[PDB]
Write a protein that binds this ligand. Structure first.
Ligand SMILES: Nc1nc2c(ncn2[C@@H]2O[C@H](COP(=O)(O)OP(=O)(O)OP(O)(O)=S)[C@@H](O)[C@H]2O)c(=O)[nH]1
Lengths: 301, 308
């Protein structure tokens, strides 16, 4: 599936996934195609995504899986020609959890680089029966090139109130897509080869994410140090066999400070890691920079 | 506190969704608008930020047939989904016209979810006009009782009182537009204190303090222009037919006065002094101001009375 404009499709499925996609649209995530797949028969969350599919008209993960399988031909036509496909059921469970692995499985058989994004709920939300959430991860993992896992519990170490906890979760979920897609789609001083992104993420397994932000003097080293040490990475970093790092910032981000952060991440990473590094121009940020680190794979000693 | 409060306004059922459309058309700022209904077509014409169609198999997109139990089940069936839309709100408004199936039965579900999450939860609903018939009146009564259980504060506006206000409504359509406007005035009279304060700043913490667990409430509205406007608008508000002449009895009162950026303390204080004198001798009264540079020489007073 060769392209020089990388075709990136972002699929939100189920109520939480469509809601995640609506937030990306509302925040102006650029360069990707949004697809909203509703999986529930009794309700429909509307969306401004350019492409929409209501497979429900026909809160169990099993119900979502069969609804998605029932619509496999339509989903495939929707995904055909993508170089990369993100799939997420977003926050909360339900039918989207059963549908996401089917979308992933189809994207991968098509040859797209297939990236799942899945959240672990906060421990205080309790647990609905049969271990559903943890079976959704395992199903998603069997059919993704890379599954990015966001353990929401680790956000309470980044003092957090309940509303702040929920909002922090929504924002890091949006970053699990945007951090990577911006690096591919929006030019910075340091640009990356999509084939290198593919070499890092194809068949790579589960990955964790870290984020950091800083302003003013020494901002790049500071934000990179926060990101590399993020509790959301759960110390995945020293074993990771593949590391992707993106620095978003204004047009005036200097080569020297860019290179300082690049050097820090190479020191932090396993000696044998592939490291993909680049920058993103976002003039809306003033003097803030924002760093995303994706750490994929594991040390096998 | 420098805290940025997140406010979500839910309209559920046809009347609630039309009220939310009116809030959007009048430029109410600082809040996210959510529309919930049992009719995919009506929702298509909503301008809300989030639109959720519920009860699709039970109603097949034609509303609850005036049956509140149908509306309750459609909302409850979509509880996890509604909760994920509300997650993160500091304050939630639930607005509807009581008396039909979708709003009557579904509003208490929305409010219970928001309350369980700990958001300050404010209902703003109408009673149907008496000419709509006794079944709608009874259904609304029951829906209001259920909603009151789920809200921190529930503001109830009787549509019958609207007919004693303003000019004689030409037509059913204009009367319901008047209902839309008063539901907007009830939401905006509170949220603009938080989102666009004037000289006397009443913030989210202050509003939570007086509206948490306050119970059933009434509203009055008044506006005037030119010389003596603040005293005039405040007197209209506290005599409002909507307040059912209950200002004297209220032990909790929130008042907001909106005016241009040149609304000054003398004027503000003249209106507050008027309202203090008409209030219960033990009333807790919070006075706040709103900047609204679109108003001209006009000021708008809103009074929320609770604690009877
Ligand atoms: N504010 C406002 N209220 C309305 C409007 N139309 C009707 N109402 C009031 O709202 C009440 C409930 O009507 P409506 O909201 O349309 O029903 P519903 O909740 O959607 O219930 P349904 O599914 O059985 S049709 C009516 O009895 C009437 O008093 C409107 O356009 N704006």
């Amino acid at each position: 599936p060769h392209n020089y404009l990388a075709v990136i499709k972002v699929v939100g499925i189920g109520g939480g996934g469509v809601n995640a996609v609506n937030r990306m649209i509302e925040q102006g995530l650029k360069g990707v195609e949004f697809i909203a797949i509703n999986t529930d028969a009794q309700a429909l969350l509307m969306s401004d995504a350019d492409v929409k599919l209501d497979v429900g008209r026909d809160a169990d993960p099993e119900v979502g899986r069969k609804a998605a399988e029932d619509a496999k031909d339509e989903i495939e036509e929707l995904l055909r020609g993508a170089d990369m496909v993100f799939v997420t059921a977003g926050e909360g469970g339900g039918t989207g959890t059963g549908g996401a692995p089917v979308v992933a499985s189809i994207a991968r058989k098509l040859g797209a680089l297939t990236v799942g994004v899945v959240t672990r709920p906060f421990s205080f939300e309790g647990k609905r029966r049969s271990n559903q959430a943890e079976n959704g991860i395992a199903a998603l993992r069997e059919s993704c090139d890379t599954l990015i896992v966001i353990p929401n519990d680790r956000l309470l170490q980044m003092a957090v109130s309940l509303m702040d906890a929920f909002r922090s979760a929504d924002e890091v979920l949006l970053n699990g897509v945007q951090g990577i897609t911006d690096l591919i789609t929006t030019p910075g001083l340091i640009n990356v080869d999509f084939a290198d992104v593919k070499g890092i993420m194809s068949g790579a397994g589960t990955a964790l994410m870290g984020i950091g932000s800083a302003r003013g003097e020494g901002r790049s080293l500071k934000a990179a140090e926060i990101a590399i040490n993020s509790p959301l990475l759960e110390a995945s970093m020293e074993g990771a066999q593949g590391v992707l790092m993106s620095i978003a910032g204004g047009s005036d981000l200097g080569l020297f400070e860019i290179n300082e952060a690049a050097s820090l991440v190479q020191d932090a990473a396993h000696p044998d890691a592939n490291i993909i590094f680049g920058t993103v121009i976002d003039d809306s940020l003033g003097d803030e920079v924002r760093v995303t680190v994706i750490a994929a794979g594991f040390d096998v000693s």
